[PDB]
Amino acid sequence: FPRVKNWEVGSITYDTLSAQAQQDGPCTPRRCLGSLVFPAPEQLLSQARDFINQYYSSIKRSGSQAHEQRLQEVEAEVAATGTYQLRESELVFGAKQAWRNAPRCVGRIQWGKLQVFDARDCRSAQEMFTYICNHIKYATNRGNLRSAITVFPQRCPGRGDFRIWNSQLVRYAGYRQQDGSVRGDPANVEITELCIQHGWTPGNGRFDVLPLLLQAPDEPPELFLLPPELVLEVPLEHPTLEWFAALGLRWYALPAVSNMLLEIGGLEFPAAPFSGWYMSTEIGTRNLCDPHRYNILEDVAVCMDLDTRTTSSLWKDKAAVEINVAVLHSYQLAKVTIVDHHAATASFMKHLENEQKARGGCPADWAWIVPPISGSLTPVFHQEMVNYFLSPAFRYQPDPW
Amino acid sequence: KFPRVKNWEVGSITYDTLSAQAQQDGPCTPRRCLGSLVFPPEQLLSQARDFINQYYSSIKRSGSQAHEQRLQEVEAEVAATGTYQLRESELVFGAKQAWRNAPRCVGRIQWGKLQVFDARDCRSAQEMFTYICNHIKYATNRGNLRSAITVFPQRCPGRGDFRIWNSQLVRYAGYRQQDGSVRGDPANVEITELCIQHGWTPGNGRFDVLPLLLQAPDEPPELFLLPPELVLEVPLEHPTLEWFAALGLRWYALPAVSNMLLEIGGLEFPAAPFSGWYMSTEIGTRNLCDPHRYNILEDVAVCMDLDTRTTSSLWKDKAAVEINVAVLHSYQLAKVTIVDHHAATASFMKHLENEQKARGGCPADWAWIVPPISGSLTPVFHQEMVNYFLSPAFRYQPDPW
Numbered sequence: 001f002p003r004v005k006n007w008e009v010g011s012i013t014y015d016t017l018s019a020q021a022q023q024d025g026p027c028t029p030r031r032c033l034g035s036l037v038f039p040a041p042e043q044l045l046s047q048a049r050d051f052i053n054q055y056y057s058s059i060k061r062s063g064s065q066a067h068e069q070r071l072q073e074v075e076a077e078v079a080a081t082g083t084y085q086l087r088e089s090e091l092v093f094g095a096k097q098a099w100r101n102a103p104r105c106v107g108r109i110q111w112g113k114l115q116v117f118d119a120r121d122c123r124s125a126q127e128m129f130t131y132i133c134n135h136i137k138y139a140t141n142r143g144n145l146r147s148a149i150t151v152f153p154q155r156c157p158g159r160g161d162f163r164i165w166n167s168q169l170v171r172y173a174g175y176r177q178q179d180g181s182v183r184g185d186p187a188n189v190e191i192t193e194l195c196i197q198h199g200w201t202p203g204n205g206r207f208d209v210l211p212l213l214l215q216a217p218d219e220p221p222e223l224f225l226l227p228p229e230l231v232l233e234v235p236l237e238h239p240t241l242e243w244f245a246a247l248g249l250r251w252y253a254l255p256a257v258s259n260m261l262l263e264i265g266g267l268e269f270p271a272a273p274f275s276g277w278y279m280s281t282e283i284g285t286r287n288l289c290d291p292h293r294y295n296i297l298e299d300v301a302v303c304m305d306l307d308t309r310t311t312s313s314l315w316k317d318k319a320a321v322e323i324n325v326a327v328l329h330s331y332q333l334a335k336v337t338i339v340d341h342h343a344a345t346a347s348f349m350k351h352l353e354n355e356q357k358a359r360g361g362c363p364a365d366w367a368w369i370v371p372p373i374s375g376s377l378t379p380v381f382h383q384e385m386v387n388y389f390l391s392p393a394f395r396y397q398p399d400p401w
Numbered sequence: 402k403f404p405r406v407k408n409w410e411v412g413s414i415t416y417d418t419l420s421a422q423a424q425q426d427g428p429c430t431p432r433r434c435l436g437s438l439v440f441p442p443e444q445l446l447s448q449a450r451d452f453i454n455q456y457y458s459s460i461k462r463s464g465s466q467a468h469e470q471r472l473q474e475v476e477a478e479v480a481a482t483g484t485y486q487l488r489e490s491e492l493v494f495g496a497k498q499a500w501r502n503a504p505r506c507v508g509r510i511q512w513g514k515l516q517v518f519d520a521r522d523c524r525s526a527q528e529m530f531t532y533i534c535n536h537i538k539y540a541t542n543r544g545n546l547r548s549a550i551t552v553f554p555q556r557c558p559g560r561g562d563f564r565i566w567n568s569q570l571v572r573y574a575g576y577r578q579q580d581g582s583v584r585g586d587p588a589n590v591e592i593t594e595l596c597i598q599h600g601w602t603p604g605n606g607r608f609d610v611l612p613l614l615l616q617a618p619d620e621p622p623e624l625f626l627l628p629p630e631l632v633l634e635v636p637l638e639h640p641t642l643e644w645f646a647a648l649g650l651r652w653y654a655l656p657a658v659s660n661m662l663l664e665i666g667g668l669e670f671p672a673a674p675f676s677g678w679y680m681s682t683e684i685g686t687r688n689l690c691d692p693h694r695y696n697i698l699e700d701v702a703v704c705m706d707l708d709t710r711t712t713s714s715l716w717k718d719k720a721a722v723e724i725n726v727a728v729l730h731s732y733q734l735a736k737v738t739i740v741d742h743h744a745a746t747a748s749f750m751k752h753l754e755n756e757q758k759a760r761g762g763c764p765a766d767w768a769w770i771v772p773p774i775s776g777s778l779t780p781v782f783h784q785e786m787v788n789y790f791l792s793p794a795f796r797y798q799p800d801p802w
């Protein structure tokens with residue numbers, strides 16, 4: 001059992017939960033690949049068995065009446081149909097566990113508070129769009145955001161998958177410019193080109209909300225525009241740099257990842273978008289300051305009258321800090337939920353202690369948990385972590401085009 | 402079997418073929434990644450043959466003349482004595498490779514410029530002290546720092562080791578109190594207590610340079626006071642915050658690690674202090690601002706009149722950036738070599754590119770290469786890395802008690 005030290009305090013724990021790691025990661029004794037972004041009924045049966053055991057553990061009913069019945073029921077259904085169906089309560093438990101198990105998520109202190117929308121009856125792309133609009137409306141909640149996931153029908157033989165082609169429900173377009181540059185968000189150039197290819201009339205702003213490409217089984221994707229009043233946005237201003245408003249920057253309230261696969265007990269849900277609320281560094285540091293994103297850092301530093309000709313003035317650090325200040329200030333001003341990296345990392349430390357007592361460990365990806373500014377100022381920097389894969393899980397999947 | 406390595410800022414892809422050469426096994430398995438953890442008779446000929454092979458290919462002399470000749474004398478030396486002596490060029494070459502191979506060092510663009518002092522004929526704590534004093538004065542060079550390593554005698558059976566008991570050549574004292582808490586450097590507390598326990602006269606202050614505890618083979622260690630004119634220190638002040646200097650903060654010029662074990666061609670040098678020059682975040686961010694180190698972040702924020710009542714004011718980030726500004730400013734004002742984390746990381750990217758051409762890859766520890774402030778503002782944040790152990794190497798080693 002790996003020993004895990006906290007260097008700020010001297011605390012030591014052992015991660016016995018990693019021993020239960022089923023699926024394997026990319027590291028070996030030869031070489032660590034931890035920093036890489038992207039690392040048969042009988043095997044269906046073992047994953048289902050393990051999940052049913054997890055569920056009956058959670059309802060304090062392991063080895064009971066209901067428990068063995070469900071095990072036999074699932075087996076019989078796998079033998080008879082090649083697959084099986086989750087009960088509603090098992091689905092809710094599985095979606096929360098998938099969040100709880102996600103090693104790159106710093107917000108997991110919230111894992112138990114997740115609104116699960118059961119869309120497993122969804123029949124079409126048009127119904128899919130309706131469900132998604134209701135997810136966005138519920139989750140946004142006029143700025144008082146609520147964690148939620150909508151679960152569309154599982155993958156099954158004989159039918160194609162439900163897929164949301166967009167990587168998030170709200171994304172800004174990225175238009176390859178006249179002179180080779182990108183207007184808008186360069187992360188979204190491909191999906192922008194897919195929307196235009198599918199009949200979307202593009203805009204030419206920097207913050208144009210993209211339409212949804214929604215794929216029903218064995219159907220080409222269909223284009224659906226989000227009603228503007230559903231997509232809550234926050235104009236960015238700075239509490240003391242009044243010229244900051246003139247940059248014309250905005251961001252959207254609702255982070256809703258829509259391209260990941262949800263796995264529960266061997267069943268796969270290729271379409272199960274989930275949403276929380278932002279941590280300010282995601283917007284202020286990554287989305288706005290990455291050289292390959294909006295890349296505003298030099299423009300801000302220049303307007304701040306910093307000396308950008310030498311790196312040792314720390315003009316980059318100073319401009320990034322104020323961009324994060326602006327993000328927090330603007331979201332608070334707009335009354336839209338947001339958490340800063342200090343509050344977020346501190347609550348993740350409480351999560352780790354909770355999980356050590358609950359399960360004997362917690363899978364965590366240090367490189368993703370530690371925030372992208374002010375790393376060692378947060379408590380998670382000084383916390384060793386063990387990364388491993390537990391199921392139920394959220395997993396990357398290939399793009400459907 | 403050749404790990405694909407992507408840079409996410411630029412889109413570029415490489416393959417680490419060097420990873421195939423990994424000798425010692427890391428802590429990672431396919432079921433769990435332990436990359437974030439700080440600390441995870443004729444087999445001598447195997448690592449000796451291998452090292453001699455490296456040396457001769459590096460001078461473009463594989464399979465010719467002195468190579469086979471030198472292959473035989475090491476064979477003869479081990480058959481006749483159970484070990485062997487390195488030629489001076491090999492000791493030099495091996496020292497540079499251990500540096501080049503250190504996966505946690507962001508300064509390795511400098512690896513080819515290293516001054517190697519050969520103390521293999523050393524034999525007494527008094528003899529070491531003069532060596533360590535040559536080094537320090539050579540390395541410091543009146544503030545124009547030069548990289549350097551002194552190699553004390555290798556380890557042999559039947560005889561105790563040369564060991565430097567301090568973790569660095571320069572360390573500030575840490576004194577416990579009538580109430581537990583520490584005046585000075587909390588990280589050194591323990592060696593401070595050993596130094597006193599061997600007859601040192603403890604000062605009272607927050608920046609008392611500790612004496613050296615030098616251990617000759619099979620002897621208790623002797624205390625050695627360093628000449629105060631030999632230990633170059635930098636009083637910390639801030640370009641525009643005139644009160645910063647009044648906080649009385651200082652740091653020393655020479656970072657010289659003195660507790661690691663140099664391994665070359667199966668040979669083990671438990672006393673081999675190496676020194677470079679500081680990256681400003683090592684002092685400004687970790688040494689001064691870690692909660693378990695000098696922990697000055699709050700004192701600076703009070704002086705800056707910052708709103709320390711709410712985390713979302715980012716007062717910690719603001720205070721931290723100014724402390725790093727102070728470090729860079731003070732070191733430059735004193736003309737003591739220092740490198741900021743932007744310059745340092747940009748040079749490492751250049752090092753990765755060189756190493757890709759030269760050896761086909763580079764073992765790199767993402768968690769230690771990315772700086773502790775402004776992580777994603779530096780290019781190494783967006784660079785995938787492969788971590789693995791190559792030899793020659795610097796390795797951690799137990800404390801000699």
Ligand code: HEM
Nearest residue numbers: 099102104105106107110147148274275276277278279394
């Ligand atoms: C409630 C507030 C939440 C916060 C503050 C939060 C925060 C974060 C952050 C900062 C990341 C890293 C993103 C990046 O750097 O690219 C992340 C990743 C992730 N989060 Fe959370 N999250 C929240 C809610 C949720 C919910 C509700 C779910 C699912 C039910 C979830 C699942 C995940 C997953 C799967 C990842 C990994 C994404 C990837 O690998 O690309 N999070 N989260």
Ligand code: HEM
Nearest residue numbers: 500503505506507508511548549675676677678679680795
């Ligand atoms: C010349 C300028 C140099 C710079 C700017 C530099 C910078 C750094 C930094 C920032 C670290 C991270 C340590 C930490 O975060 O506590 C590090 C680690 C390390 N450096 Fe370098 N270094 C330099 C020279 C050298 C030299 C000359 C050697 C050996 C010959 C060396 C070998 C190492 C090793 C082995 C580590 C890992 C130490 C550990 O794990 O504690 N470095 N360096």
Ligand SMILES: Nc1cccc(CCCCNCc2cccc(OCc3ccc4ccc(N)nc4c3)c2)n1
Nearest residue numbers: 037255257275276277278279367368409782783784
């Ligand atoms: N509030 C909330 C609530 C719910 C969910 C989320 C997460 C938003 C997730 C968006 N997923 C974007 C993404 C995916 C893959 C790679 C990305 O960038 C590449 C990259 C390269 C190197 C890295 C090194 C360290 C590190 N930590 N990240 C890296 C990312 C972005 N947020």
Ligand SMILES: Nc1cccc(CCCCNCc2cccc(OCc3ccc4ccc(N)nc4c3)c2)n1
Nearest residue numbers: 007381382439656658676677678679680683768769
């Ligand atoms: N200029 C230069 C030049 C040459 C050499 C150096 C290195 C200075 C070494 C001082 N240090 C050594 C050390 C050893 C072990 C632990 C340490 O700290 C604890 C800790 C815990 C978690 C971490 C997670 C990530 C990360 N990056 N570091 C961590 C450090 C320090 N410097």
Ligand SMILES: [Cl-]
Nearest residue numbers: 255282283287
């Ligand atoms: Cl985002």
Ligand SMILES: [Cl-]
Nearest residue numbers: 656683684688
């Ligand atoms: Cl240091």
Ligand SMILES: [Gd]
Nearest residue numbers: 239240241242
């Ligand atoms: Gd102003």
Ligand SMILES: [Gd]
Nearest residue numbers: 246247299303
């Ligand atoms: Gd402008």
Ligand SMILES: [Gd]
Nearest residue numbers: 703704705706
């Ligand atoms: Gd004042």
Ligand SMILES: [Zn+2]
Nearest residue numbers: 027032429434
């Ligand atoms: Zn690993």
